[PDB]
Amino acid sequence: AYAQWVIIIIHNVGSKDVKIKNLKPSWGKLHADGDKDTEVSASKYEGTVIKPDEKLQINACGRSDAAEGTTGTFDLVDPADGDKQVRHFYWDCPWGSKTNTWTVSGSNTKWMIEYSGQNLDSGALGTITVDTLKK
Numbered sequence: 001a002y003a004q005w006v007i008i009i010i011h012n013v014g015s016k017d018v019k020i021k022n023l024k025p026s027w028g029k030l031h032a033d034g035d036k037d038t039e040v041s042a043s044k045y046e047g048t049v050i051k052p053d054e055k056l057q058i059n060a061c062g063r064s065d066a067a068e069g070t071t072g073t074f075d076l077v078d079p080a081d082g083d084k085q086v087r088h089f090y091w092d093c094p095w096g097s098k099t100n101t102w103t104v105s106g107s108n109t110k111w112m113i114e115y116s117g118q119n120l121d122s123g124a125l126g127t128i129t130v131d132t133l134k135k
Contacts, residue, residue: 002036004028004062004069004093006100006125010076012050014112014133018086019049019079020056027092028062028070036061049079050132062095069094070125076132078108086111086132093125100125110135 012018023030023042030045032038040059050056062069070093076086087106094100102118102125112133119126 001062001066001069001095002064004095004124005036006060006070006091006093007127008058008060008089008091009127009129010050010056010058011129011131012052012054012133013131014135015052016134017049017051017079018111018132018134019047019077019083020045021047021075021077021083023058023072023074025060025070025072027068027072027094028060028066031059031061033057033059036064060091060093062093067095076111076113076130078111078134081110084108087113089130091125091128098122102128 030040060070073090077083086108090103092101100120115130118128
């Protein structure tokens with residue numbers, strides 16, 4: 001259902017380019033900003049280079065009237081280091097469960113990734129701002 005939703009805002013707060021790769025929704029769909037009725041494909045964002053002080057916004061929700069939510073993964077990669085993984089992200093805003101998941105993993109010490117705005121308890125995962133900085 002549309003009630004299972006997340007908005008991911010990736011803001012490059014550093015001075016070096018970051019890139020999005022392997023954007024893979026596994027449940028639900030991606031949609032246009034402020035418009036859940038307009039499906040957008042992952043290819044719209046796949047490989048986008050986020051330059052210093054730019055943002056990239058991804059909107060994901062459960063399919064219309066479906067007893068299923070939104071789940072997926074993506075990577076942030078370093079385009080200046082042969083697309084070396086920066087961090088791996090996993091999101092889940094499931095239908096008929098009070099627990100959402102937002103997991104960030106990885107081991108690239110040249111980067112600092114901060115996130116906030118998530119809601120793990122009941123209803124939507126919310127609007128998550130992910131700030132990226134290459135140290």
